[PDB]
Amino acid sequence: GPLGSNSPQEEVELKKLKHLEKSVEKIADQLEELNKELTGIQQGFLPKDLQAEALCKLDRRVKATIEQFMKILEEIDTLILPENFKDSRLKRKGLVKKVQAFLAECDTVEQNICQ
Amino acid sequence: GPAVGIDLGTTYSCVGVFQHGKVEIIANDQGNRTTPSYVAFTDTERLIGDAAKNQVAMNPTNTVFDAKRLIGRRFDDAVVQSDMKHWPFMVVNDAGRPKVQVEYKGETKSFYPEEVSSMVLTKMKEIAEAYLGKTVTNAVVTVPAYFNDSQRQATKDAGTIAGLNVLRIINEPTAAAIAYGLDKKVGAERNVLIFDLGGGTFDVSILTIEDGIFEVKSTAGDTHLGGEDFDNRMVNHFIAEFKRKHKKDISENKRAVRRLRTACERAKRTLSSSTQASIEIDSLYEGIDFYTSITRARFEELNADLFRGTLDPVEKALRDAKLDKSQIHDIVLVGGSTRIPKIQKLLQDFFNGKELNKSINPDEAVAYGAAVQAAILS
Numbered sequence: 001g002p003l004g005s006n007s008p009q010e011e012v013e014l015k016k017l018k019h020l021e022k023s024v025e026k027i028a029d030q031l032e033e034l035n036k037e038l039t040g041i042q043q044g045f046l047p048k049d050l051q052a053e054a055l056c057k058l059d060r061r062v063k064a065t066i067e068q069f070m071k072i073l074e075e076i077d078t079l080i081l082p083e084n085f086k087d088s089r090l091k092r093k094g095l096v097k098k099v100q101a102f103l104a105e106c107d108t109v110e111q112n113i114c115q
Numbered sequence: 116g117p118a119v120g121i122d123l124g125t126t127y128s129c130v131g132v133f134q135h136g137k138v139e140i141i142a143n144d145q146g147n148r149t150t151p152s153y154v155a156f157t158d159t160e161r162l163i164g165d166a167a168k169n170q171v172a173m174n175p176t177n178t179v180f181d182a183k184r185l186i187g188r189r190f191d192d193a194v195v196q197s198d199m200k201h202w203p204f205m206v207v208n209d210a211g212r213p214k215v216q217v218e219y220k221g222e223t224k225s226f227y228p229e230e231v232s233s234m235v236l237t238k239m240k241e242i243a244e245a246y247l248g249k250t251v252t253n254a255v256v257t258v259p260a261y262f263n264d265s266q267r268q269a270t271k272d273a274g275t276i277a278g279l280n281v282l283r284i285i286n287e288p289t290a291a292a293i294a295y296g297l298d299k300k301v302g303a304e305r306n307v308l309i310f311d312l313g314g315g316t317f318d319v320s321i322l323t324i325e326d327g328i329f330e331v332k333s334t335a336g337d338t339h340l341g342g343e344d345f346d347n348r349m350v351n352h353f354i355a356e357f358k359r360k361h362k363k364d365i366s367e368n369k370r371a372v373r374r375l376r377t378a379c380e381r382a383k384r385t386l387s388s389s390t391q392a393s394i395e396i397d398s399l400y401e402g403i404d405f406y407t408s409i410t411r412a413r414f415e416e417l418n419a420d421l422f423r424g425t426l427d428p429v430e431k432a433l434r435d436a437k438l439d440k441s442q443i444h445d446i447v448l449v450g451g452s453t454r455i456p457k458i459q460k461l462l463q464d465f466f467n468g469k470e471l472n473k474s475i476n477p478d479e480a481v482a483y484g485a486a487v488q489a490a491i492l493s
């Protein structure tokens with residue numbers, strides 16, 4: 001492919017990816033809030049039974065976060081980017097890797113609670 | 116407020132209204148012309164339609180679907196006993212009657228199939244009201260031609276629980292025939308074959324129409340056959356391709372299989388109007404990108420047995436109706452999977468190049484005909 005041949009058509013794909021990047025940031029914020037809540041439950045005065053109820057409510061929320069990240073991946077998976085759209089391809093790969101790193105963090109939470 | 120036509124399907128439902136000399140299929144709150152026949156029970160609420168289907172992966176045990184496979188049946192019915200194995204939700208026996216058992220607002224609750232179906236009907240009613248900006252009370256609700264008295268009555272009960280005045284219950288193949296106006300054609304008795312392949316079921320019905328009297332001559336089909344099976348064959352094909360190219364098995368990674376399956380369902384739809392489809396999935400498994408394509412011909416080979424298999428029911432229904440294939444005046448395609456060119460080709464070739472009735476959206480034809488009948492009864 002040619003050098004410095006950025007095209008208007010690519011801008012359309014890059015805008016789609018930017019909107020997905022922003023949706024990922026919002027989901028990530030939800031993950032950080034869930035992380036804070038989990039710490040709070042652990043450092044709180046809830047007795048065993050109420051602690052379990054609070055961790056299982058937190059579990060449903062972590063399952064919701066995982067699902068949102070999965071829907072983002074399914075959305076990114078609809079993209080077909082020509083080999084010449086190097087910048088879009090780099091952005092798509094980086095975003096998928098970022099989502100997969102957040103999914104691994106969700107998994108650490110989800111498997112540590114409401115067993 | 117006018118009268119509506121509602122197609123209550125196993126996996127998807129559809130509502131239509133006849134206005135300004137034309138039938139309007141009504142889009143739901145999410146803009147979809149069809150709504151999942153799903154009801155989900157959560158700690159904080161009850162979800163219906165797209166909202167219920169959208170959280171199925173999160174809450175599989177408490178999300179109900181396929182109520183139509185249980186409605187009006189006894190618990191010991193073979194269909195109830197066989198179908199239970201495939202559902203993530205609990206089905207219990209309440210004095211010979213099946214009930215679906217779920218966790219709802221921190222409590223173990225059970226519902227009769229007509230109650231689950233009434234919730235789906237409530238959603239279809241609400242969908243119509245949101246579009247029309249008028250109250251909707253009257254409706255024509257469709258049922259499969261093989262439904263018995265119990266199943267028909269239980270469907271009517273679902274309408275009544277939902278606050279609907281169920282004007283009439285009509286068979287799904289009758290609704291499909293009505294949409295195409297096959298009862299309005301002048302001449303002798305007309306033999307109509309309805310080929311219905313949608314929502315996970317395959318139903319073939321032969322009807323004879325004469326002076327507006329619809330006679331169901333025969334019914335045949337497969338209880339479990341549809342788009343999910345065709346997607347599965349493409350998933351197998353891709354999993355094998357990934358093993359050949361990378362010597363890695365992605366089958367045990369549920370997320371990798373899901374991303375692949377979602378892409379396959381989309382590629383299959385592209386294959387109904389294009390001869391090739393491409394898929395690009397970054398970091399599918401173990402950081403490996405999977406960029407591939409599939410031709411319509413390969414998709415057809417992967418599904419050869421299933422596609423050819425659809426003619427067995429057609430042959431069975433013809434033999435039960437005591438009719439030669441040349442005695443069939445009209446053929447109607449119903450259900451989303453009838454959009455598959457190979458399925459259309461097999462059916463047209465079996466009927467010696469006869470043209471198929473397919474101009475009406477296959478997913479919408481049953482609701483369309485029910486909306487026509489609801490207008491006539493207004």
Ligand SMILES: OC[C@H]1C[C@@H](Nc2ncnc3cccc(OCc4ccccc4)c23)[C@H](O)[C@@H]1O
Pocket residue numbers: 126127149313314315341342343380383384385387450451452454455478
């Ligand atoms: O449960 C409903 C069936 C219908 C299948 N739809 C289609 N299959 C093949 N070619 C298609 C071409 C265009 C549109 C299609 O359906 C879109 C659709 C999606 C969801 C519900 C209804 C219709 C097609 C869909 O993939 C699913 O397996």
